[PDB]
Amino acid sequence: DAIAIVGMSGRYPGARNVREYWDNLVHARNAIRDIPTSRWDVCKSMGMLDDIEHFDPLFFNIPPSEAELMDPQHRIFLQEGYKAFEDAGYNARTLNEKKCGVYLGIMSNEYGVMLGNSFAIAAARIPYFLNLKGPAIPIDTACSSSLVGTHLARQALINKEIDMALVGGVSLYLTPESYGANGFVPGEGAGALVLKRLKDAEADRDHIYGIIIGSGINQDGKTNGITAPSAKSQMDLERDIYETYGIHPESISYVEMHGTGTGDPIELEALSTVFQEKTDKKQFCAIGSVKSNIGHTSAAAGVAGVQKVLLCMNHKTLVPTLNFTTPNEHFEFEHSPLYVNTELKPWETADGKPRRACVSSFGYSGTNAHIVIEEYQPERSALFVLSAKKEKQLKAYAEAMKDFVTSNEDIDLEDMAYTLQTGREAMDYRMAFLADSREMLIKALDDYLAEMPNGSIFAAHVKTKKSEIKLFETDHDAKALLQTWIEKKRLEKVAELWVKGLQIDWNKLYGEYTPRRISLPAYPFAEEYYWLP
Amino acid sequence: DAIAIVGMSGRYPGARNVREYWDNLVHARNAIRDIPTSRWDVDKYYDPVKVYCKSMGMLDDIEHFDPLFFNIPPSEAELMDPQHRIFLQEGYKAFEDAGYNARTLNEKKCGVYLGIMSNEYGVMLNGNSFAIAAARIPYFLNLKGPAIPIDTACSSSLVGTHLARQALINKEIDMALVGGVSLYLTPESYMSMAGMLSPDGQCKAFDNGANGFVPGEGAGALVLKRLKDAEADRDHIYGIIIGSGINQDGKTNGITAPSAKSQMDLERDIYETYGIHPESISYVEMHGTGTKQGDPIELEALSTVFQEKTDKKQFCAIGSVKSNIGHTSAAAGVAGVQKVLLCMNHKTLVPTLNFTTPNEHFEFEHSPLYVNTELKPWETADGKPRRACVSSFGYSGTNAHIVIEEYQPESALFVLSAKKEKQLKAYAEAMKDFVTSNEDIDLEDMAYTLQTGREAMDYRMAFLADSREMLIKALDDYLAEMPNGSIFAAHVKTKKSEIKLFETDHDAKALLQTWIEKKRLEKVAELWVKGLQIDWNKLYGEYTPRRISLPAYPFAEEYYWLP
């Protein structure tokens, strides 16, 4: 039935993550810049990612020398994909042998040619690293790729062929060669979503961004030139989805258009016509395109749009679409169900109905996709733990957490700790601390970073402390003592032992109030430069 | 109310500055050496039963001075007590540490309170009065606050601190330089033993084997302000003084004996007057001279006063830097205050030395006090600032005790200059070492301090950097004389004609102002080194960086001694 989106990660022009992405959208920021000479010597504009050469190959058990031979599209998605899992609150341990499919939108080979680097391998990186067992399939339907992938993952989950799916897209523009409405400006990006059956997501107590309640794909078929759109195919696609899944156009209040700024009028007419077949209501449905902010992120276009929509729903807020002064002459808005939203405003819904939105993505090869997303409506000291594979990254992790807590005054401290305990892998470099308030939490992380002694803070490298924790691992009364500590109160003791490498049973910390996993900052990868050898 | 310490400079045995001092303390280093023959021949005075001590905490190069810097004729330098000369330098550097310069100090109501207790050089010669020693700095910098030398023996610099504090609180002065300086130049003076000195040559503070002190040399200075002014002026703040007091032993058994009752009264009265609970204090820098009858009296006194107010046991660590550097006499107080501030800044307690077995005449186990011999984190509970005390008692019976509380605060263009090229080179070396040693330095703060917190002198260099590594490389390139297109250097007296255009023309000035306005640094740099006055404030808009502690002027190391 319904598919839950339980994890997301994103890296788009002007946005290193989904929180910056949201902030940029709220403030109507445009990330399009002139192409610098460090890329190539110069349309002279692009929605660019920063530091596309950066990778943490050691994290992924990849030899540094192999990293130079990897398409950065592979490298960046590997990172974003992984972070999507961590966002959902899953780790290497909990993913091991999971029937998780990987569906990766990808549509260019630039690095391989400039020079392992097949589409087939690009999709297979994450399954190989995490020991996943669902199929790994790259999808090249051009700009519809990530949304096509979403559809396929959706169908596999519903048929119970997999129990989880990582869907995503990645697009870089590396060469000069591969490169009011007047055409589009190319964008770069990488995004991933983690999908589950809704019933599983609720039983597993995942945090849920939203649910997919309908999706479809089809073809333009014979058009006037292979890259031209078909009004009829777009209409059929949208109609068939709404009819198959019992979705009334009146229930939809936002559509993230394909909206490349070429094509535009055909898309508008199609969607308008389909809506009007079912309702007389006027100007109820806002339309936008994040391509106005970040450019045309190609294979990653679908996932960029889906993430925008989920963020909108989560904040119950509609954000401006950009570059709109006067309506396209070829379409008449006044008596349409559609209106272009250029305001930052509250996303209003009537009588506690869940917000619904659509995302469209159409490819130059004629393969179309369209999905319908519905807002999800859900029914003392804590022990904070952090770890990373190097001390430098632990420090970066602490900074990321401090920024996050500073930015989010309403964070549930118990949920956050719980996520750090159960929703992250305990790696070799460790710190832990107690806090009973936001202020104490921020102070602790500050103290850690500034190296100001603080009696609530514990840190160790696990390999150094082996002899010191053995006393607890094998003896029966030591375990009983630890269990008494963790069953339950002293937390200081649990903390000291945990940072030294002792495995803790985090479940025992909680009698019949158990907190929930929430979205937190994911691993801060080492930012090492790798390019052509 | 509270007095902020906003600048410091120190020169102690084994330590040319407070950074080396700190390093020595962290590593539990003992700086006491055998007295070399270049000072005097201990064999000509030594008798084991005449001097019975052959050790001293010595300063290096007590003869070095930069008289030209201070507008003093080189020939007058030979006639100056080196105590005067060394304090003149250390005092000046304390101001520079705080980020103040000749320009910003001119006509300031700044008092100068200098601890000093010996006349050896003046006598050797047969200008050098205590009155003149204190007045050197006011004369040089045109300060207008009273200049008073304090001789209460070993309490001198702490007595001075008390007096400066009361003057600031009464608003009689707006700044105070407090300091001490002590040298031991002759066999005769260091000699007086009077039974005071240890035959082993160690201050064994708190130890059952305590048998006298070993003499130490030193010069220190602090810059003090009212806390409210220090915050409004955006000074960097080492710590605050939240209580001080002085009193007398009065009638003792011999004028150099201590009085338990006076020490207790002193400590009690301070705590009561200023509302300070003994439980809040976690370190005390003891007078701790390692004398057999003195040590136990100090311990018992302090212990007793603490115990009047709390049953808590072994919460307060005690130490004495005299275990590291010896008994630096007039400079003892300032040496101790500087130790405590460094501890607070680093949130670290350091070892006190020479402690094997507790003094039999005092039981620690049920005391609020414990001897700290560990290098460890200085822990504080809850939000609370660390608090520490420093005690200094004199042989004449004038005592002092202060309470210090930790202060809890709420590309760049680098410029350097010196009065000679050789010193400019020394300055760059000092900055490079500093940056190398301090991997976490805020580059914007450091530049801002170099711009606004130093006098622009005649020999100049400047450069841009956006990172520590770039900064270090520039200074290396400068020192190695290896071409670097971002390094500029000039002698100002040579370049007058090349600058005049920007000083007299109206649209050249408007261009310069736009350059400083429209953010260009290379241009500002080139002009600055040639002698053009820059308005550094204009470089900063919404965000202004803060002054921080940096290495101070590296004085010329010229030798001057008896004529």
User: What is the full DSSP assignment across B352-417?
Assistant: PPS-SSB-TTS--TTSSEEE--S-EE----TTPPPEEEEEEE-TTSEEEEEEEE------EEEEEE
Chain B residues whose beta carbon lies within 8 Å of the beta carbon of residue A452: 347
How far lies B306's CA from each of B269, B302, B359, B371, B381, in Å?
12, 6, 19, 15, 19
Q: Per CB distance under 8 Å, which residues of A are interface residues toward B?
A: 452-453, 455
Strand B147-150 relative to strand B110-115, pairing: parallel
The residue type of B374 is E
The residue type of A127 is P
Q: Is residue A529 included in any domain, yes or no? A: no
- Across the interface, do A453 and B378 touch by the CB < 8 Å criterion? yes
Strand A252-256 relative to strand A285-288, pairing: parallel
Query: What does the alpha-carbon distance between residue A55 and residue A390 come to, in Å, rounded to a whole number?
Result: 14
H or E element that contains B435: helix B421-437
The residue type of A413 is L
Query: What does the alpha-carbon distance between residue A500 and residue A387 come to, in Å, rounded to a whole number?
Result: 11
How far lies A348's CA from each of A223, A251, A257, B262, B338, in Å?
39, 12, 20, 77, 63
Chain B residues whose beta carbon lies within 8 Å of the beta carbon of residue A444: none
CB distance A170 to A187 below 8 Å: no
For this structure, is B287 an active site residue? yes
Q: What is the CATH number of the domain that holds A238?
A: 3.40.47.10
Interface test with B, best of A399, A454, A456, A492 (most B CBs within 10 A): A454
State the residue range of the domain holding A229. Answer: 1-379
Q: How far is A436 from chain B (nearest CA, A)?
A: 12
Same domain, residue pair A437 and A302? no
CB distance B370 to B391 below 8 Å: no
Q: Which two tokens stand for residue B344?
A: 């607070």
Task: Report the residue numbers after which chain B has a gap, meaning the C atom sits over 2.5 angstroms from the next written residue's N, or none.
Answer: 49, 126, 193, 410
Q: Which of A349, A379, A409 is the last residue of a domain?
A: A379
How far lies B27's CA from each of A413, B11, B193, B341, B351, in Å?
41, 18, 30, 17, 8
- Across the interface, do B348 and A453 touch by the CB < 8 Å criterion? yes
Q: How far is B281 from chain A (nearest CA, A)?
A: 17
H or E element that contains A434: strand A429-435
CB distance A344 to A322 below 8 Å: no
Query: What does the alpha-carbon distance between residue B190 and residue B329 come to, in Å, rounded to a whole number?
Result: 11
Catalytic positions of A, written as ranges: 143, 258, 296
Question: Could you count the other beta carbons within 10 Å of the beta carbon of residue B48?
Answer: 8
CB distance B458 to B493 below 8 Å: yes
**Which residues contact residue A325 at a Cβ distance below 8 angstroms, ignoring those fewer than 6 apart?**
A180
Quick one: DSSP state of residue B260? H
Cα angle: A59, vertex A64, A67; to 5 degrees:
90
Which residue in this structure is represented by tokens 């940096």? Answer: B550
Query: What does the alpha-carbon distance between residue B54 and residue B48 come to, in Å, rounded to a whole number?
Result: 10
Q: Is residue A518 included in any domain, yes or no? A: no
The residue type of B313 is K
Same domain, residue pair B401 and B455? no
Of B225, B221, B252, the C-alpha closest to B241 is B225
- Across the interface, do A452 and B378 touch by the CB < 8 Å criterion? no
Same domain, residue pair B382 and B467? no
Q: Is A274 helix (H, G, I), strand (E, B) or coil?
A: helix
Q: Is residue A138 included in any domain, yes or no? A: yes
Cα angle: A218, vertex A171, A425; to 5 degrees:
105
How many residues would you count in chain A?
Answer: 533
Query: What does the alpha-carbon distance between residue A186 and residue B410 come to, in Å, rounded to a whole number?
Result: 46
Question: Could you count the other beta carbons within 10 Å of the beta carbon of residue B114?
Answer: 30
> Given phi > 0 = left and psi -120 to 50 = alpha, else beta, which region is B494?
alpha
Same domain, residue pair B421 and B473? no
**CA-nearest residue of chain A to B348?**
A453
Burial B124-156 (b: 16+ CB within 10 A, else e): eeeebebeebbbbbbebbebebbbbbbbbbbbb
Task: Report the residue numbers after which chain A has a gap, meaning the C atom sits over 2.5 angstroms from the next written residue's N, or none.
Answer: 42, 115, 179, 262, 379
Same domain, residue pair B481 and B402? no
Same domain, residue pair B408 and B426? yes
Chain A residues whose beta carbon lies within 8 Å of the beta carbon of residue B379: 453, 455
Same domain, residue pair B376 and B251? yes
Q: How far is B548 from chain A (nearest CA, A)?
A: 16
Quick one: DSSP state of residue B225? E
Query: What does the alpha-carbon distance between residue A121 and residue A74 come to, in Å, rounded to a whole number?
Result: 8
Query: What does the alpha-carbon distance between residue A275 and residue A285 come to, in Å, rounded to a whole number?
Result: 10
Q: Which of B53, B84, B110, B154 is catalytic?
A: B154
Q: Which of A379, A413, A440 is the last residue of a domain?
A: A379
Q: How many helices (H) and strands (E) does chain A have?
A: 18, 20
> What phi and psi values does residue A244 have, to the nearest 5 degrees?
-55, -40
The residue type of B487 is I
For this structure, is B346 an active site residue? no
**Which residues contact residue B318 at a Cβ distance below 8 angstroms, ignoring those fewer than 6 apart?**
B206, B283, B284, B285, B286, B288, B299, B302, B352, B369, B370, B371, B372
Query: What does the alpha-carbon distance between residue B355 and residue B409 come to, in Å, rounded to a whole number?
Result: 36
Q: Is residue A523 included in any domain, yes or no? A: no
Same domain, residue pair A116 and A13? yes
Same domain, residue pair B298 and B226? yes
Q: At what angle do helices B18-26 and B332-346 cross, to 10 degrees?
A: 70
Q: How far is B432 from chain A (nearest CA, A)?
A: 23
Q: Which two tokens stand for residue A305?
A: 């749009």
CB distance A98 to A164 below 8 Å: yes
How far lies A30's CA from each of A23, A186, A260, B516, in Å?
12, 13, 15, 30
- Across the interface, do B348 and A452 touch by the CB < 8 Å criterion? no
CB distance B357 to B209 below 8 Å: yes
Q: How many helices (H) and strands (E) does chain B have?
A: 19, 20
Query: What does the alpha-carbon distance between residue A199 and residue B307 come to, in Å, rounded to a whole number?
Result: 66
Q: Which of B84, B236, B287, B401 is catalytic?
A: B287
Of B443, B450, B431, B410, the C-alpha closest to B534 is B450
CB distance B109 to B174 below 8 Å: yes
Same domain, residue pair B217 and B301? yes
- Across the interface, do B381 and A452 touch by the CB < 8 Å criterion? no
Q: Which of A379, A413, A438 is the last residue of a domain?
A: A379
Query: What does the alpha-carbon distance between residue B365 and residue B371 come to, in Å, rounded to a whole number?
Result: 11
Q: Which of B162, B236, B327, B401 is catalytic?
A: B327
CB distance A260 to A285 below 8 Å: no
- Across the interface, do B347 and A452 touch by the CB < 8 Å criterion? yes
Same domain, residue pair B354 and B500? no
Query: What does the alpha-carbon distance between residue A483 and residue B207 come to, in Å, rounded to a whole number?
Result: 45
Q: What's the number of domains chain A is made of? A: 2
Quick one: DSSP state of residue B56? E
Query: What does the alpha-carbon distance between residue A49 and residue A51 come to, in Å, rounded to a whole number?
Result: 7
Q: Is residue A530 included in any domain, yes or no? A: no
Query: What does the alpha-carbon distance between residue A490 and residue A498 come to, in Å, rounded to a whole number?
Result: 13
Same domain, residue pair B533 and B548? no
Q: Is residue A233 included in any domain, yes or no? A: yes
Half-sphere exposure for A445 (CA within 13 Å, toward CB): 22
Query: What does the alpha-carbon distance between residue A17 and residue A9 come to, in Å, rounded to a whole number?
Result: 7
